Design an enzyme around this catalytic site. Sequence first.
Site, PDB file in Angstrom:
ATOM      1  N   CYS B  13       0.825  -1.203   0.000  1.00  0.00           N
ATOM      2  CA  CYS B  13       0.000   0.000   0.000  1.00  0.00           C
ATOM      3  C   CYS B  13       0.862   1.257   0.000  1.00  0.00           C
ATOM      4  CB  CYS B  13      -0.941  -0.011   1.203  1.00  0.00           C
ATOM      5  SG  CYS B  13      -0.099   0.019   2.802  1.00  0.00           S
ATOM      6  N   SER B 515      19.106 -12.997  18.891  1.00  0.00           N
ATOM      7  CA  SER B 515      20.250 -12.146  19.191  1.00  0.00           C
ATOM      8  C   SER B 515      21.070 -11.770  17.965  1.00  0.00           C
ATOM      9  CB  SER B 515      21.163 -12.832  20.213  1.00  0.00           C
ATOM     10  OG  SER B 515      22.263 -13.454  19.577  1.00  0.00           O
TER      11      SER B 515
HETATM   12  N1  LIG Z   1      13.557 -13.156   7.739  1.00  0.00           N
HETATM   13  C1  LIG Z   1      13.685 -12.060   8.523  1.00  0.00           C
HETATM   14  N2  LIG Z   1      13.171 -10.867   8.152  1.00  0.00           N
HETATM   15  C2  LIG Z   1      13.293  -9.773   8.927  1.00  0.00           C
HETATM   16  N3  LIG Z   1      13.923  -9.765  10.114  1.00  0.00           N
HETATM   17  C3  LIG Z   1      14.484 -10.893  10.609  1.00  0.00           C
HETATM   18  C4  LIG Z   1      14.395 -12.130   9.821  1.00  0.00           C
HETATM   19  N4  LIG Z   1      15.024 -13.085  10.527  1.00  0.00           N
HETATM   20  C5  LIG Z   1      15.478 -12.511  11.667  1.00  0.00           C
HETATM   21  N5  LIG Z   1      15.161 -11.205  11.716  1.00  0.00           N
HETATM   22  C6  LIG Z   1      15.507 -10.287  12.827  1.00  0.00           C
HETATM   23  O1  LIG Z   1      16.922 -10.308  13.005  1.00  0.00           O
HETATM   24  C7  LIG Z   1      17.287 -10.825  14.285  1.00  0.00           C
HETATM   25  C8  LIG Z   1      18.190 -12.033  14.069  1.00  0.00           C
HETATM   26  O2  LIG Z   1      17.974 -12.999  15.092  1.00  0.00           O
HETATM   27  P1  LIG Z   1      18.442 -14.522  14.866  1.00  0.00           P
HETATM   28  O3  LIG Z   1      19.909 -14.514  14.517  1.00  0.00           O
HETATM   29  O4  LIG Z   1      17.460 -15.190  13.936  1.00  0.00           O
HETATM   30  O5  LIG Z   1      18.278 -15.164  16.332  1.00  0.00           O
HETATM   31  P2  LIG Z   1      18.804 -16.650  16.650  1.00  0.00           P
HETATM   32  O6  LIG Z   1      20.301 -16.547  16.492  1.00  0.00           O
HETATM   33  O7  LIG Z   1      18.344 -16.896  18.064  1.00  0.00           O
HETATM   34  O8  LIG Z   1      18.124 -17.510  15.613  1.00  0.00           O
HETATM   35  C9  LIG Z   1      16.009 -11.194  15.017  1.00  0.00           C
HETATM   36  O9  LIG Z   1      15.919 -10.461  16.241  1.00  0.00           O
HETATM   37  C10 LIG Z   1      14.867 -10.808  14.101  1.00  0.00           C
HETATM   38  O10 LIG Z   1      14.081  -9.781  14.709  1.00  0.00           O
END
Ligand SMILES: Nc1ncnc2c1ncn2[C@@H]1O[C@H](COP(=O)(O)OP(=O)(O)O)[C@@H](O)[C@H]1O
Lengths: 714, 714
Positions: B13, B515
Amino acid sequence: KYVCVRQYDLTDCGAACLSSIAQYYGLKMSLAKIREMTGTDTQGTNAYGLIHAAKQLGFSAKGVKASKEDLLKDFRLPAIANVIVDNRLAHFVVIYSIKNRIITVADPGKGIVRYSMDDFCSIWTGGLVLLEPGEAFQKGDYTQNMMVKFAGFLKPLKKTVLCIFLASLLYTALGIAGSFYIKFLFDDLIKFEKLNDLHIISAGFAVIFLLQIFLNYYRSILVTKLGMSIDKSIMMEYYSHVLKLPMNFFNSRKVGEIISRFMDASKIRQAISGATLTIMIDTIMAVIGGILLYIQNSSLFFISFIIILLYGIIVTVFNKPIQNANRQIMEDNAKLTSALVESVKGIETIKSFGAEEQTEKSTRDKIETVMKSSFKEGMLYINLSSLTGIVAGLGGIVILWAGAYNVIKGNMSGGQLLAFNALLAYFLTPVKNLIDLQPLIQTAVVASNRLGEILELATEKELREDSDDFVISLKGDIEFRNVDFRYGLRKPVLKNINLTIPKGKTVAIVGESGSGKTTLAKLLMNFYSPEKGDILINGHSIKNISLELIRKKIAFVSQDVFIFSGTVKENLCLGNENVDMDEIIKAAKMANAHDFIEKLPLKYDTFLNESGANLSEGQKQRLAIARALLKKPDILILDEATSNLDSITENHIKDAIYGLEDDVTVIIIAHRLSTIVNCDKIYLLKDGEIVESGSHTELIALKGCYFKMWKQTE
Amino acid sequence: KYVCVRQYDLTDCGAACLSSIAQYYGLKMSLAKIREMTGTDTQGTNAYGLIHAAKQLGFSAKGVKASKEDLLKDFRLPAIANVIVDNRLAHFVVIYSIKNRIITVADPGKGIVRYSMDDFCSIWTGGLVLLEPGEAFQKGDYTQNMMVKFAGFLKPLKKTVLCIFLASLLYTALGIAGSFYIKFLFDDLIKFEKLNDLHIISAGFAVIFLLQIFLNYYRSILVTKLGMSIDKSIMMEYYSHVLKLPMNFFNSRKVGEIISRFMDASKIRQAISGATLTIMIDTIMAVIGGILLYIQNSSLFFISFIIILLYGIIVTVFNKPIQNANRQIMEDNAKLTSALVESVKGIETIKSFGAEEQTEKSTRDKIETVMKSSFKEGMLYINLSSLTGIVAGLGGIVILWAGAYNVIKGNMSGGQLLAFNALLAYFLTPVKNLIDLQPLIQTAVVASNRLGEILELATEKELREDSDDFVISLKGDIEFRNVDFRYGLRKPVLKNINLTIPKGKTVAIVGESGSGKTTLAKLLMNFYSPEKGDILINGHSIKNISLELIRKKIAFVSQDVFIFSGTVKENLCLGNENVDMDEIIKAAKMANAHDFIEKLPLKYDTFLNESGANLSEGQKQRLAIARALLKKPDILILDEATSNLDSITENHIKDAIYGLEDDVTVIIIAHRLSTIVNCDKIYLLKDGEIVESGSHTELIALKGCYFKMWKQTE
Ligand SMILES: Nc1ncnc2c1ncn2[C@@H]1O[C@H](COP(=O)(O)OP(=O)(O)O)[C@@H](O)[C@H]1O
Ligand SMILES: CCCCCCCC/C=C/CCCCCCCC(=O)O[C@@H](COC(=O)CCCCCCCCCCCCCCC)COP(=O)([O-])OCC[N+](C)(C)C
Ligand SMILES: Nc1ncnc2c1ncn2[C@@H]1O[C@H](COP(=O)(O)OP(=O)(O)O)[C@@H](O)[C@H]1O
Ligand SMILES: [Mg+2]
Ligand SMILES: [Mg+2]
């Protein structure tokens, strides 16, 4: 005759085969009932389920693994054979006759087909099920005609149907009257050069046509309203019944299977309101048209009758192949869309492994298969259309030829021939529609069976025993006597758990993953029932407590929490509607959610898009815990409610639920041993039975499975 | 003119509003380019993304909250305003003019609408985005015509289009010639009582009709083949381009959004092969029919021209409301289906809280909304059909009336009138089809734009830099320099991530949930690129190594494991096309998967139904680990690859990884601290930073966050 019961879903091939055998032997019953008997799950059924259902259905069944040579020997013909298609999906078929190297098999997916011996044993797995009526196989017809049940929806709407019939009759009469304009033009007005009569008669026929248009408008509005009403009634009845069915109905089916029954409502409506009205109108319409055509000339009427006979013959001949092609196209499209969904959902792995070229090749191959099926159906339709067009056009030319011959012989006039050509529409179109009603009625009958076999299933309240009204609370000792349980017909999950949970005590259950802890939690909550034994609360059997009270005094926090699309005020008040804001705030306080929800936009009214997709897993878990303590239960079960949450919030909820008011029993199912050490009693469950119990120090003192697990996990 | 760019999807949008503003100010660009410019994720965009994209596009954008009294004052009219649709959707609208208490707004979901100031302020959030072109706003038309682009598939098929055109011309000529049978009957044969001439002429016209039918058969076959070919070509091109797009395209869109273009392919084909052929045939055939009708009689031809003019006017008038009603019906049906899926999926919670009564009420309300929309569209269709039927029937009656008048006056004969009635089909059907081409062409253009904005997106390879051909392996020290990162335009995940993995030494990364560890794992594999700094292996930048080599020498085991529908061997060999079974067995043994696969039916060709739905979480994860070790990598990343395993399998995989030959780097992203203690170096990640690095000995001794978490989690 070889009975071949069609399969409604993708996982009831064995149930369909068993139903086919029963119908062949004289017993016809609901396919949903048999699908329940065979222990069918979301992954189809197996041989053991078929043998069990046949044994408890009256047959004397058995299982046998045989090779190709055993088929040459003599045995009972109607057996069930497990087959594998495309080094892929496992189906069941019913062998009906072992002829010379050719085998007739009923496959629920396709129909009655003939397989030569070599390819049959190429696709047929060595498994085999032999069936034979036993001592008690009383034949019966334990099913109801389901088109009558849905046609009973027309009783409240007999006023609307009556007006439609009258409007259609008047419309047909006006059209038949106006079809003589061409007769009046040539025989009377043009021949005698009458001009004033010409103008007057033309104006009259224009007025007649305008009246016809108005009648069509009114009838169309009425028909649309009737169809909408019937659709709404059928969908609402089906949904209301489905929401009451027991929990074993939803875990034996997929979401798609339950959802797809809504289109069956429209499929049934298209014949409940459409087919009946079409029959009633068109029978009289075609009778009047035929009488008028015979009045005009007998030979031309016979020619038109031959035309419509040929059209009906061609349509009837082409009926079945077209539906077979449509089913094949649907299967191929389903396969292609499943492949596309799988390849786009796991795109990260494809990219990481560099498989973007082979996935493209597989998708291209599936697209080629879809196009081949589409071309087969298109060729069938083209052949049908060509034959129908030949019949119609040659019949029209022959009618003009014979009419000119009759006019030459003086049997009839040119205006009469043109009037016959005009009335040919009002004679042929009704009969054409009556013939074309056949494909619609068959689909409507299939949909009616599919939707109404579910409506016969007993709900959760109907299966309950007599309840004692003197029980008003669930506070007390929770006693698990010798309890057996198995999900349908699989291997048993719980064998001999016999435990006691004291009232107002924090009790913990720990064990390996997939051991039967969530199963215990659902058994306590009356989802499913123990196969053997009883569950008692304060000395009272779990079956004798009213279901409404049992679900209102036991709160659950599942491992996979679910949050519905709505405001936080509505997600935290799923069951009750009259609840104060202060209670909601207090409940959210203990779950460490109020501070989080306050930071969200607005207040406790924010809408949660896409089942709370904006939410994170820990936040949804906190929301579920807040809802649970908001329910004000007598027993509170937490099935790994703190798996994802961090240390601070986990400790906060631990101390919050630790110091709860009143003697409310708390059960915590834990995977991480270090999370809980302060629980009053700890139960060790390994493979469906409890082996150790007591306080945390007590199990440490007694060397056993608990100590080994603690040492190897901490 | 007020520009209103409709939204192609549900989450664009704001992108559509920005595109509308740009087009209003003279700058037209692709919607996909703007959508990726705004940082649009699956949850839509916000004010920050729109402001950033506008500033990148040359505008001078700002964001400010405005009150009701603020709209009374004067500011730049073309501004984007955040609104809340039906307390569910956070949409954006384009305010165009502030009239007397009425606000004109372009909403991408509906169109150009007018809102009363009270109602608008009720549905308008205080946020506001003000846009104004800056110094550098060079206008342009940076887009191409997708219809011309997709019309290039007709170039290799120019011979088939020529055969269809000639067959259609011959078919039309034969039909026009055969329409004179009734003229020859009444003027010549019937009047003069010619019998042998009657038979001869009837046989000739029957032969002409049979030739017409054969031509129709051949033309239909060719048209079906052409349509299938064009559809397959478009589908395959779209999928081949989609599979090559970067990962920021796949996580910013839903699965349905990507898959829905496979139907847009058919929608484009319906005008690529339908509209052009229909125009080419029908223009000529209508011209011939009109010339012939004018030859027969001028007044009747003028009457028929007026009839077709009225039909065209009515159809054009009813065009837009019908499609608006259809869009509303689609929206309501989508909402109802989403609610049904939500209710069925969360049936356990509904049963546990006893909320079956209210869910039924909500579903009934949504069904009522769907029925209201259906009735609106049905009434529109009924009105259109009534007007068209009035026009057609009264035109036929008036034509017969005027023809009889002319016959009486002597300007034409009865046979001429009947032949005119016959040729009315070949004159009116072509123009009717040409008028009916309007809904097809508009939908086809929308679908073509929707499918072709993607094809303009740059693929992963095109965005890369020059590749160093002297790099052959990724074995070396892995250095993360000052690295920043942020998904889309959200809050940054990594700030100054600076670290060094030694060559061949096993290293672990620990931290809290959400994280930024899986983000590091994706960054090391060229999924997404760091905002700042560079990632190096052996002193070579990550951007100067070929993408094929990087994805081949790095293996990834994500926290979620995806298994594709197929045999175990195919899944274990996803990338490489050539490998012997001994290596598969060896890889399966070290992942503790071989024993499980052996117990399955068949040995290694067991096809996994429904993306391995039969397998459990542990079995899937072990199989993925086996695949990754079979990949023979130089860097192996295990992002929480031991969570669902029991202790025995966890230890087996742990000392299998520790028993890996060659100097292969191993990185283990671990959530549970106790799971890794023997790693050569451990990096601690709390908030986009490594604050503590080293082995377990020094980190425990050094007071800090790691010490606190170890104390509070063990
Ligand atoms: N596909 C995505 N799209 C947008 N933001 C994301 C995506 N994946 C993760 N994030 C953001 O980036 C951060 C990365 O965290 P992540 O490394 O996935 O945590 P963990 O290591 O516990 O899996 C998260 O806090 C999330 O909010
Ligand atoms: C709702 C959907 C409707 C769609 C249809 C759209 C059109 C609707 C309206 C159509 C009417 C206008 C079209 C032309 C009609 C006459 C044409 C003709 O015969 O040619 C002649 C008409 O010259 C005359 O003499 C006029 C006398 C009319 C004859 C009767 C016509 C009957 C049509 C019913 C009236 C319509 C009723 C309306 C009801 C709909 C000319 O050649 P002539 O023979 O030599 O003429 C002798 C005198 N002259 C030499 C001086 C010229
Ligand atoms: N919905 C279901 N249908 C059929 N079988 C199930 C279902 N849920 C669990 N099972 C089986 O029952 C066993 C018990 O699992 P469960 O008690 O859910 O594990 P946990 O106690 O760790 O939650 C599992 O091995 C699983 O195979
Ligand atoms: Mg579980
Ligand atoms: Mg992760």
